[PDB]
Coordinates of C-alpha atoms and ligand atoms in Angstrom, one line a residue:
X1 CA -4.5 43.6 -17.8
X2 CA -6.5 43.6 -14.7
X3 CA -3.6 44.7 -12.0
X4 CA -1.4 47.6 -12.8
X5 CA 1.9 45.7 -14.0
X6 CA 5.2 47.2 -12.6
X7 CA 5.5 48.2 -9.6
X8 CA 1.8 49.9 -9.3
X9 CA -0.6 49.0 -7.1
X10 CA -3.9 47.8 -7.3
X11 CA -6.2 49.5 -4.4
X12 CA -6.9 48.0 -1.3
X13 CA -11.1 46.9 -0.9
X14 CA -12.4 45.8 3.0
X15 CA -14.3 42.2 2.5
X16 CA -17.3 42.4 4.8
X17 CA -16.6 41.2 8.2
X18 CA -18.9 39.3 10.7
X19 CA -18.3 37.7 14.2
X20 CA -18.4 33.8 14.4
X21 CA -20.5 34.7 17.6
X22 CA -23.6 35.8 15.7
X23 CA -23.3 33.2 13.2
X24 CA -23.5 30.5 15.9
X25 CA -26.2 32.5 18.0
X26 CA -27.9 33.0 15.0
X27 CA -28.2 37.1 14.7
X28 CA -25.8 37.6 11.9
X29 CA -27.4 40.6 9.7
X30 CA -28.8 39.4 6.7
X31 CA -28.0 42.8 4.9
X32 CA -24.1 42.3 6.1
X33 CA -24.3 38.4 4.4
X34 CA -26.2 39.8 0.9
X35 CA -23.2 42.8 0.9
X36 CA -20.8 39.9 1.2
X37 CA -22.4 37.6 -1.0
X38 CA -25.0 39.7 -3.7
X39 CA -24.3 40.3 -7.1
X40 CA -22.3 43.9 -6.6
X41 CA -20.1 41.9 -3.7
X42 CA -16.7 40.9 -3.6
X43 CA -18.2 37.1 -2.8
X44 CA -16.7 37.0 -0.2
X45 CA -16.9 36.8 3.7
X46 CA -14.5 37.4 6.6
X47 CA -15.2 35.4 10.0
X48 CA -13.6 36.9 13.5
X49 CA -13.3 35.4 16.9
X50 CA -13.0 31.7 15.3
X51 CA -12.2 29.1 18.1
X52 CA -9.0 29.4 20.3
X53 CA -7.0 26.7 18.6
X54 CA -7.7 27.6 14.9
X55 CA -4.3 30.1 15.2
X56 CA -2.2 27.2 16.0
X57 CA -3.6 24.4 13.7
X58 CA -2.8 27.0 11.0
X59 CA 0.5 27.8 11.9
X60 CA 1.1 24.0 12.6
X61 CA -0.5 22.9 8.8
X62 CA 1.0 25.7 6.8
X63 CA 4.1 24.9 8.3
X64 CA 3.5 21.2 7.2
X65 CA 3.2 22.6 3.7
X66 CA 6.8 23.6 3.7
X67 CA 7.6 20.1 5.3
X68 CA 5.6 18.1 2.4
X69 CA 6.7 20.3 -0.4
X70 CA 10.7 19.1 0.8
X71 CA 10.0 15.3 1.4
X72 CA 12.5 13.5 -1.1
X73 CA 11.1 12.6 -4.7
X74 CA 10.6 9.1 -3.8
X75 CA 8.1 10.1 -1.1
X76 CA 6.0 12.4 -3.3
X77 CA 6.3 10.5 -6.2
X78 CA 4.2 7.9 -4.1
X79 CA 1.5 10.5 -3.6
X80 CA 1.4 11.4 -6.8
X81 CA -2.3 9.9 -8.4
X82 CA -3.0 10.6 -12.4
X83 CA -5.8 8.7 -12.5
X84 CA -7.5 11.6 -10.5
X85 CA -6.6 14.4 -12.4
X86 CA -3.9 15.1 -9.7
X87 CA -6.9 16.5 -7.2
X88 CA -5.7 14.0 -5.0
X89 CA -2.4 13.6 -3.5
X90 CA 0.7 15.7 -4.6
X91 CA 1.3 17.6 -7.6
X92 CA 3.2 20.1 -9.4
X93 CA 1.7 23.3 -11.1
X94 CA 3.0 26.3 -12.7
X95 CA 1.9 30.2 -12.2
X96 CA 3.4 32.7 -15.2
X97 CA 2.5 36.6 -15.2
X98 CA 7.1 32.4 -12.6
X99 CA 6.4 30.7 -9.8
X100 CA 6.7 26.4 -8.9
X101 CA 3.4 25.7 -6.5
X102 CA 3.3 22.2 -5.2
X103 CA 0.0 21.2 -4.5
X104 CA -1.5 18.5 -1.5
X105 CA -5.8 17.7 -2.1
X106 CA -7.7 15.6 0.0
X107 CA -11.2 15.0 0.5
X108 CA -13.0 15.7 3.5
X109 CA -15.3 12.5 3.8
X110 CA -13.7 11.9 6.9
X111 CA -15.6 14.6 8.5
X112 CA -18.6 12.9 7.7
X113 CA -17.1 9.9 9.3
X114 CA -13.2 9.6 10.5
X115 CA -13.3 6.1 8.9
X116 CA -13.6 6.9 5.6
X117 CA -10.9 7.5 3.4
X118 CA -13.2 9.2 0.1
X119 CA -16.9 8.9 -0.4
X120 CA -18.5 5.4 -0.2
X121 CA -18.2 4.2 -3.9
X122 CA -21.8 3.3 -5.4
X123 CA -22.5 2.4 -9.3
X124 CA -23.5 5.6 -9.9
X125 CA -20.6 7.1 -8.0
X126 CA -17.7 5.6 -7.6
X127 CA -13.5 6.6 -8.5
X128 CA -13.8 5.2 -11.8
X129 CA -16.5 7.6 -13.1
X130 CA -15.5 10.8 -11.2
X131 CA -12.2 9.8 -9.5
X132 CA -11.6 13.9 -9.6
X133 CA -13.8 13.8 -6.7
X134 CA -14.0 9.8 -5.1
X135 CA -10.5 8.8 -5.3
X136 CA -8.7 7.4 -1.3
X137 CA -6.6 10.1 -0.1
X138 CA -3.1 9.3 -0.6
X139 CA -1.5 10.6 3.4
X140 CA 2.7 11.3 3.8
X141 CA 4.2 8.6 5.7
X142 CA 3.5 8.8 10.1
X143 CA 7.2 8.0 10.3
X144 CA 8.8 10.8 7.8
X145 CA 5.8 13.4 8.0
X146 CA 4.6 13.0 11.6
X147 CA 1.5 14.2 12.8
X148 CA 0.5 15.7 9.2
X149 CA -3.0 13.8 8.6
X150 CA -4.2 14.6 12.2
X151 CA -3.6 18.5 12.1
X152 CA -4.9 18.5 8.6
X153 CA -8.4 16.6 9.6
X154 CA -8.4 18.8 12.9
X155 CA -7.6 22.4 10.6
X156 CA -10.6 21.0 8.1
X157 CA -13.3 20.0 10.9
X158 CA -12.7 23.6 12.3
X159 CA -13.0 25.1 9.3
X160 CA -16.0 23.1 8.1
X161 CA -17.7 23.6 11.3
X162 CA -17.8 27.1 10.5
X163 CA -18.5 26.8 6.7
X164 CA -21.7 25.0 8.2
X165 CA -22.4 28.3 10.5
X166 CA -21.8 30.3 7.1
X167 CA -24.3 27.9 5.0
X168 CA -27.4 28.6 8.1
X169 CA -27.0 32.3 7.2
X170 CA -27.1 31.6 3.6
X171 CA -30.2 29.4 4.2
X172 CA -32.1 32.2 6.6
X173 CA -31.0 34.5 3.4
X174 CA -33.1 32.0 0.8
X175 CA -35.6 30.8 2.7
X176 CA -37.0 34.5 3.0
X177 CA -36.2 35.4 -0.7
X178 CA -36.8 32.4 -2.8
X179 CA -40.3 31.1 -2.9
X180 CA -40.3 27.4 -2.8
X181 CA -36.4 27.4 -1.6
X182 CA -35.9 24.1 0.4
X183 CA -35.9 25.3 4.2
X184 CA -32.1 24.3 5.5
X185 CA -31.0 22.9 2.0
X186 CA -27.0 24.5 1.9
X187 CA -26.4 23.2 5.5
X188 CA -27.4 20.0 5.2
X189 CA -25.4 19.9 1.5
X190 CA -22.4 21.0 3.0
X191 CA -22.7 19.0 6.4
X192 CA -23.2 15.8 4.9
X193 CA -20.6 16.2 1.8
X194 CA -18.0 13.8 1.3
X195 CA -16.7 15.8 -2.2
X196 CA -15.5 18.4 -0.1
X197 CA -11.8 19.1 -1.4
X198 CA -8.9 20.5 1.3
X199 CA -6.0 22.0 -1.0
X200 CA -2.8 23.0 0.8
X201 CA -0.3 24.6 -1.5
X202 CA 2.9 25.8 -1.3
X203 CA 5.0 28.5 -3.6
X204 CA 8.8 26.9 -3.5
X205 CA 11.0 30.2 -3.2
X206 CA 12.6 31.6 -6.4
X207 CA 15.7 33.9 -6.9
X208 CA 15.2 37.0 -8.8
X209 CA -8.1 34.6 -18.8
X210 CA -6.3 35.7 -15.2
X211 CA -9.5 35.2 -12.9
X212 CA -11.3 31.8 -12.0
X213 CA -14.5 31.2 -10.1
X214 CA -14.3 28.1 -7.7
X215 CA -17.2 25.7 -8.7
X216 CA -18.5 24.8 -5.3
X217 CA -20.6 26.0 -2.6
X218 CA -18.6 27.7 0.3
X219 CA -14.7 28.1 0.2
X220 CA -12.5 28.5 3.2
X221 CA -9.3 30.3 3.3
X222 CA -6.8 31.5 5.5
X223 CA -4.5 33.8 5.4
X224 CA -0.8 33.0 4.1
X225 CA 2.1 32.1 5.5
X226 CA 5.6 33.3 4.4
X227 CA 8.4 31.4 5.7
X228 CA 12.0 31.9 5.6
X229 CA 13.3 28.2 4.5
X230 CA 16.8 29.2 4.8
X231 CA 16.1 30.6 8.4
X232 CA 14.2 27.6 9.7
X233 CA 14.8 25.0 7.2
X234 CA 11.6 22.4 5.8
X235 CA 13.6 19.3 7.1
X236 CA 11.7 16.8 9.4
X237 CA 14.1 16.7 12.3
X238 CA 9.8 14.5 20.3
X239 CA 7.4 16.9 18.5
X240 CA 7.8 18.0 14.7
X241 CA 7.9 22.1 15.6
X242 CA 6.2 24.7 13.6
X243 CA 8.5 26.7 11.2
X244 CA 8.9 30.7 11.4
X245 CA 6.5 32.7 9.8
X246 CA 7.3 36.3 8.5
X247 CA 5.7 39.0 10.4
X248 CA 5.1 40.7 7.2
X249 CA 4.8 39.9 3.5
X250 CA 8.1 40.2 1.9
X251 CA 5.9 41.6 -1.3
X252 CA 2.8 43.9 -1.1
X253 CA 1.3 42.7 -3.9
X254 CA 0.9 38.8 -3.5
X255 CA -2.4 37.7 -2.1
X256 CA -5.7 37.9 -3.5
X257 CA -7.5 39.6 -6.6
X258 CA -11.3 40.1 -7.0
X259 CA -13.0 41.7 -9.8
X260 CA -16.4 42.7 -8.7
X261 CA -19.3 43.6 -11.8
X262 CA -17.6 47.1 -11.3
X263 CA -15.2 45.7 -13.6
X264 CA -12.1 46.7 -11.8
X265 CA -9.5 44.4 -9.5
X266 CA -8.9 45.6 -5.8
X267 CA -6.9 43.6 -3.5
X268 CA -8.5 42.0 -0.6
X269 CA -6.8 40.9 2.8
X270 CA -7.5 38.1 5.4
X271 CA -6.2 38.9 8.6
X272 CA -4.1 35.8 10.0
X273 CA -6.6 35.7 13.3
X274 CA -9.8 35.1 10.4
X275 CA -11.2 32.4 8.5
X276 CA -12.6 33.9 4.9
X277 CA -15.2 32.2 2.7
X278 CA -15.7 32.6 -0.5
X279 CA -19.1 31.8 -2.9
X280 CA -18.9 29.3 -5.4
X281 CA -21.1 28.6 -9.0
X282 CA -22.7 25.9 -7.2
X283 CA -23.8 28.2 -4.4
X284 CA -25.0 30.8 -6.9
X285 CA -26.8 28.3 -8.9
X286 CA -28.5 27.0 -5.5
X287 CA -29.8 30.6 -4.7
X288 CA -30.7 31.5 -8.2
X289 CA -28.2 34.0 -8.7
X290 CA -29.3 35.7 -6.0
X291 CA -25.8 35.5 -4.1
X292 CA -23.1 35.1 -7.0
X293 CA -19.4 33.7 -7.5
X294 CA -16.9 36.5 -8.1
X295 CA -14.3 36.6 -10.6
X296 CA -10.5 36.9 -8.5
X297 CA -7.1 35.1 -8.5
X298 CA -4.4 34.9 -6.2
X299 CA -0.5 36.1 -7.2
X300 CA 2.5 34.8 -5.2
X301 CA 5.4 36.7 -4.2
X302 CA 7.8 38.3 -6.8
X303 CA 11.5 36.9 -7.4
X304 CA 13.1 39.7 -6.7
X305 CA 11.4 39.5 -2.8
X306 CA 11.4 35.3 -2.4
X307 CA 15.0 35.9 -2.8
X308 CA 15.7 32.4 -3.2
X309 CA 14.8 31.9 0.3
X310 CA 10.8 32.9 0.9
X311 CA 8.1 30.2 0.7
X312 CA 4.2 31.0 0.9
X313 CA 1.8 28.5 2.0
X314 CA -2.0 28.1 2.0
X315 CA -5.2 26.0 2.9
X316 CA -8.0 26.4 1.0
X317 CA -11.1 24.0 1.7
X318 CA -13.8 23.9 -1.5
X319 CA -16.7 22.9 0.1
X320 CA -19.4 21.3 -2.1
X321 CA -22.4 19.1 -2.8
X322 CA -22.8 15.1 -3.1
X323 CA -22.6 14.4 -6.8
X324 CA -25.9 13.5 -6.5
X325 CA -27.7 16.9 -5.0
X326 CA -29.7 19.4 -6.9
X327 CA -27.7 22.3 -7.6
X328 CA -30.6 24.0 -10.1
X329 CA -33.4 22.9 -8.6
X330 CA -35.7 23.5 -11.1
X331 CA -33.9 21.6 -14.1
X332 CA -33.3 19.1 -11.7
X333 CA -29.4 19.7 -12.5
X334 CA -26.9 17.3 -9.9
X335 CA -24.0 18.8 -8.8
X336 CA -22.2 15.3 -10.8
X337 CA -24.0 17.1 -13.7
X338 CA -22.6 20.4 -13.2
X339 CA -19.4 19.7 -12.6
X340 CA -19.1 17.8 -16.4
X341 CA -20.5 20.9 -17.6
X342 CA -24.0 20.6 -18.0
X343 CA -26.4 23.9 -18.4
X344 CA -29.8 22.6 -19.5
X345 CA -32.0 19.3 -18.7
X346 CA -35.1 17.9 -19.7
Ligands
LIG1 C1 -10.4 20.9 -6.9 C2 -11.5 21.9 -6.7 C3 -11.4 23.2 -6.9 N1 -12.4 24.1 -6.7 C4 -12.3 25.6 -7.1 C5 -10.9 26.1 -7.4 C6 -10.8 25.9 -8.9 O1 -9.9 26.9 -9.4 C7 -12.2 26.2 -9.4 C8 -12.6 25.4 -10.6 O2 -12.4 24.0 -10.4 O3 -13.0 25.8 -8.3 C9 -13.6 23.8 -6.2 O4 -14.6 24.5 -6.0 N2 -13.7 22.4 -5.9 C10 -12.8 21.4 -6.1 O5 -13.0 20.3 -5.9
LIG2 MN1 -10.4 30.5 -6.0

């Protein structure tokens, strides 16, 4: 038990908050990034005054979360790929403490380049060895899901973007603590990735170990979206129009979990106007432990407040190296290493 069960609440912690300003002029405070990101942190990282159009790219994609999540079986079952471990296309997924979460991944290769559809395949890399990561994205119909790969790529780039801002201030971090740290070395990983992973997921409404660290460098979040589905029904029906979000959370205690090296679980917020990152094992194994993943999870909403009628949806973009980066640099340990679990090299 890390969350008082019942009806009790866990407390409320601040994440550490910077202005995407500094980060693009450069003047972040490096003391503010190592209390977000050290090893006593929360890992994680809350950006302000992001770009004027990221509030409604997010309303528009969450809302498109809904939409998906609705699209008759035959349409999902034709984005459904096993093959790839269901981290790409559509899936369904379980939470128990009861909740059905329907799951859409893509990779982001095609912020790299627009063309691509996945990472260009090579012998060493290609779908067949680590399809988890390389597989073609597998898009919704234009004609039954209009306008859904668009916003997604647009809500992504944005979000990357500032993920590469995010990445400079880790690197102005390393450069002046590590001694032989390669000058620039998580920008350039993340700005050049094609294994970056977009997952937007939806909790379908319901009548009336616990923590995971993500495995890749920097993750962006935003905050979620409740919608009323009997209110403004998921049904494609000119424009498609967003769907109505809820003011408020219909339950206080959805959201997210982290469990600092205090040992104890506080809630943490994103405000709906902020873009959040969190740090990954592959970041912490890039700085030496010097920043560190954090242990959290994330709980939907209760039965007894969906009512049979709330959905929550969420973005969450896992960016991370090229299989074939250094993520310990002194093993000489890729990220393709890392990821199937190797801890030592020679
Ligand atoms: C699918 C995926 C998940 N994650 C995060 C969320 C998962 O719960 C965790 C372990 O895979 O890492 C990534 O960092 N990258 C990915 O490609
Ligand atoms: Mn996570």
């Amino acid at each position: 038990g890390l969350v008082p069960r019942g009806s009790h609440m866990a407390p409320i912690a601040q994440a550490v908050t910077v202005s995407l300003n500094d980060l693009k002029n450069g003047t972040v405070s490096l003391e503010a990034l190592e209390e977000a990101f050290g090893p006593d942190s929360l890992g994680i990282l809350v950006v302000k005054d992001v770009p004027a159009e990221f509030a409604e790219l997010r309303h528009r994609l969450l809302s498109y979360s809904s939409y998906l999540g609705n699209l008759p079986k035959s349409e999902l079952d034709r984005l459904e790929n096993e093959k790839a471990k269901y981290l790409t296309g559509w899936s369904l997924g379980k939470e128990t403490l009861d909740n059905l979460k329907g799951s859409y991944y893509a990779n982001c290769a095609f912020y790299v380049d627009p063309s691509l559809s996945c990472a260009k395949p090579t012998e060493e890399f290609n779908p067949d060895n680590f399809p988890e990561y390389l597989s073609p994205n597998l898009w919704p119909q234009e004609s039954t899901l209009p306008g859904f790969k668009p916003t997604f790529e647009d809500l992504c780039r944005l979000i990357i973007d500032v993920a590469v801002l995010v990445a400079r201030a880790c690197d102005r971090f390393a450069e002046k603590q590590i001694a032989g740290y390669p000058a620039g070395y998580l920008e350039g990983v993340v700005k050049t990735s094609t294994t970056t992973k977009a997952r937007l997921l939806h909790y379908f409404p319901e009548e009336a170990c616990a923590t995971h660290l993500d495995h890749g460098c920097l993750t962006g979040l935003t905050s979620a979206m409740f919608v009323d589905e009997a209110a403004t029904p998921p049904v494609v029906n000119g424009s498609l129009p967003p769907l109505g979000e809820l003011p408020t959370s219909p339950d206080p205690k959805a959201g997210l979990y982290i469990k600092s090296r205090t040992g104890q679980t506080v809630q943490v917020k994103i405000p709906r106007d902020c873009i959040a990152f969190q740090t990954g094992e592959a970041l912490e194994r890039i700085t030496g432990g010097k920043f560190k993943a954090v242990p959290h999870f994330v709980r939907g909403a209760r039965a007894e407040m969906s009512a049979g009628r709330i959905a929550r949806n969420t973005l969450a973009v896992f960016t991370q190296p090229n299989l074939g980066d250094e993520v310990d640099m002194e093993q000489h340990i890729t990220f393709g290493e890392f990821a199937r679990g190797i801890v030592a090299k020679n």
